[PDB]
Design a protein around this ligand. Structure first.
Ligand SMILES: CNS(=O)(=O)Nc1nccc(Cc2c(C)c3ccc(Oc4ncccn4)cc3oc2=O)c1F
Ligand SMILES: Nc1ncnc2c1ncn2[C@@H]1O[C@H](COP(=O)(O)OP(=O)(O)NP(=O)(O)O)[C@@H](O)[C@H]1O
Ligand SMILES: CCCS(=O)(=O)Nc1ccc(F)c(C(=O)c2c[nH]c3ncc(Cl)cc23)c1F
Lengths: 322, 266
């Protein structure tokens, strides 16, 4: 209640961020234990390979929320432990992490109710924008680097799934992370219950060796390339396809095999800045030890440039989706 | 059409049982309890209409006590298939949710009946292509019924449910058609593993993409050290034989059946 507000003061916020975080925590106090009966469906906000996400209204509070339905057949003991482990999200209050309201189990689906983002995922944004301008990919990078270091310091947790569809954006110009690995039982359950069409997985995680947040940095670099150019990069673009996006399919195993055997993808030269190119090249180093880490990324030239560049992110977003 | 199309006014949909990505399964009423699988397709293309009537034609050829009883279809309002209702739960729920205490003689019977149903399908030139313990239902607890075969014509518009039961040749997808009687045997082998261990394979790996890579390369395989101690040593051999990485080294179901039948003669 006010134990949440004490941990706000342990973070380095500015004037406009503390305003919004304090406003969200007060709305967290309007809602109690959530149930399937408490919600009125508004619209549908996604159809991931995993579970459908609805925009919904919580009747007692009036609040609008995003409801992720995760269908899983698990014994009741695992159900209760998944909901217990998800409660750490009440304490995950940061400008770069989407908010949490509550989680519960109904029917055969775990419901996760979280902060609504009217901008959607950058996956959804990408398919409307074609490609994302580099200036904005600088601001996105900052948000991701800050969200990962927040998780590692204040929670000792990795994201484990950094992808364009797990980065969400707000009309207020906020860029936040979502769908990270809080519950170890939920991690085990979703490996057995779904299949994937693409992969942002680090080559060391594919091979079973020891991994750290460096794997998330590799995933960020792969997401940045995919958002810079307008295509997933594991199968590098053809000499033709390059000359069809700027001017002057593989099965899941073949993708995973490529990420382990062939050199990582690169940003196409000439169309992007040299620093941004060097930035993704430092993120996509295969050996995790010689890959850039989180502090090195925050002092890289591309980040100090982008942090200083005042960009109207909120404006560009409302122009390209409406 | 043909005489297996059911008018929608005749069917009363009751409760919601399961909901995957390719459709939703409701319990219903149509001359007694029935199961209705409604496909998530609101604008079915003339192509998908033909693939549906084709998969229905394949369902029309199965009449066997270990195969789920096809009963009819609906093609106007929506695309759906009507089958018998199994009173028990799926084999997955028995083994991994309820954790029901089967005895050793019951596990072999489930193994034998599953092989009996699969033998029938292959004798009719039907490849399941997506066998898991989710698709094996225990009607009233005693007799297994195999379902979720067919409609591989409409699902391709490689399975997208789970990878735990996929044969390595199917995981790699290097052929245009890696599906065979032995890819089904591998899947049956993984179900045998479930039956004889009580848990799913690769329980220590929690990364689907790791599982896909490790199993496609041959670096990972079901851990047979977790087989029950009361599991007969001939049954242990059968698990290993079905799970073999080489597609041509795996037994066919006439042999699998005989292996179990002679084992069953205690
Ligand atoms: C692909 N990587 S993996 O390691 O194999 N698997 C997994 N990776 C990450 C995660 C998971 C499991 C997982 C999911 C999917 C999740 C989704 C939404 C959520 O809600 C929420 N609310 C507010 C803010 C942030 N999240 C919390 C969540 O916690 C989890 O542990 C993996 F299963
Ligand atoms: N809190 C939220 N607010 C707004 N949109 C959300 C929220 N949570 C999820 N979404 C949307 O839900 C969509 C699908 O998400 P999800 O179901 O996680 O599948 P995915 O991320 O596209 N891939 P996978 O992780 O394999 O399921 C995303 O594109 C988001 O835009
Ligand atoms: C003859 C096979 C038809 S199918 O291959 O399309 N599979 C199918 C079709 C319709 C269904 F309802 C189902 C199904 O899931 C069930 C059928 N009977 C059941 N009884 C219990 C449960 Cl939990 C599930 C089912 C099902 F597996």
């Amino acid at each position: 209640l006010e134990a949440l507000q004490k941990k706000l003061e342990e973070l380095e916020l500015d004037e406009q961020q503390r305003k919004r975080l304090e406003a969200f925590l007060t709305q967290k106090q309007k809602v109690g234990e959530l149930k399937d009966d408490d919600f009125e469906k508004i619209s549908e906000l996604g159809a991931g390979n995993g579970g459908v996400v609805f925009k919904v209204s919580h009747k007692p509070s009036g609040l609008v929320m995003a409801r992720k339905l995760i269908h899983l057949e698990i014994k009741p003991a695992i159900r209760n432990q998944i909901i217990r482990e998800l409660q750490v999200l009440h304490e995950c209050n940061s400008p770069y992490i989407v908010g949490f309201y509550g989680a519960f189990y109904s029917d055969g689906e775990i419901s996760i109710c979280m902060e609504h983002m009217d901008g959607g995922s950058l996956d959804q944004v990408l398919k409307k924008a074609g490609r994302i301008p580099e200036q904005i990919l600088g601001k996105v990078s900052i948000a991701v680097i800050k969200g990962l270091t927040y998780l590692r310091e204040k929670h000792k947790i990795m994201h484990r799934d950094v992808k364009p569809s797990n980065i969400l954006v707000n009309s207020r110009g906020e860029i936040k992370l979502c769908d990270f690995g809080v519950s170890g039982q939920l991690i085990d359950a979703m490996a057995n219950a779904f299949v994937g069409t693409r992969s942002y997985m680090s080559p060391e995680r594919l091979q079973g060796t020891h991994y750290s947040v460096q794997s998330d940095i590799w995933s960020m670099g792969l997401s940045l390339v995919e958002m810079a150019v307008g295509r997933y990069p594991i199968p590098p673009p053809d000499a033709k396809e390059l000359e069809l996006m700027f001017g002057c399919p593989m099965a899941i195993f073949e993708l995973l095999d490529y990420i382990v055997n062939e050199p990582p993808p690169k940003l196409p030269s000439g169309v992007f800045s040299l620093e941004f190119q060097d930035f993704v090249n430092k993120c996509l180093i295969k050996n995790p030890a010689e890959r850039a880490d989180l502090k090195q990324l925050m002092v890289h030239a591309f980040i100090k440039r982008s942090d200083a560049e005042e960009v109207d992110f909120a404006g560009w977003l409302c122009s390209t989706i409406g | 059409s043909d005489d297996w199309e059911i008018e929608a006014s005749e069917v009363m949909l009751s409760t919601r049982i399961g909901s995957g990505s390719f459709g939703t399964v409701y319990k219903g009423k149509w001359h007694g309890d029935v199961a209705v699988k409604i496909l998530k397709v609101v604008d079915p293309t003339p192509e998908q209409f033909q693939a549906f009537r084709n998969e229905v034609a394949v369902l029309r050829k199965t009449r066997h006590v270990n195969i789920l009883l096809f009963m009819g279809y609906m093609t106007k309002d929506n695309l759906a298939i009507v089958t018998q209702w199994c009173e028990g739960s799926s084999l997955y729920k028995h083994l991994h949710v309820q954790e029901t205490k089967f005895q050793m003689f019951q596990l072999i019977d489930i193994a034998r009946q599953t092989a009996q149903g699969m033998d029938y399908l292959h004798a009719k030139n039907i490849i399941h292509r997506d066998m898991k313990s989710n698709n094996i239902f225990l009607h009233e607890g005693l007799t297994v019924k195999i379902g979720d075969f067919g409609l591989a014509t409409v699902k391709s518009r490689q399975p997208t449910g789970s990878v735990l039961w996929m044969a390595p040749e199917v995981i790699r997808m290097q052929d245009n058609n890696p599906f065979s009687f032995q890819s089904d045997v591998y899947s049956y082998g993984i179900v045998l593993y479930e039956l004889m261990t009580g848990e799913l394979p690769y329980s220590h790996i929690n990364n689907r993409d790791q599982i896909i890579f490790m199993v496609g390369r041959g670096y990972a395989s079901p851990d047979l050290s977790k087989l029950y101690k009361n599991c007969p040593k001939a049954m242990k051999r059968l698990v290993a034989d079905c799970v073999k990485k080489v597609k041509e080294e795996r037994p066919l179901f006439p042999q699998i059946l005989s292996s179990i039948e002679l084992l069953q003669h205690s």
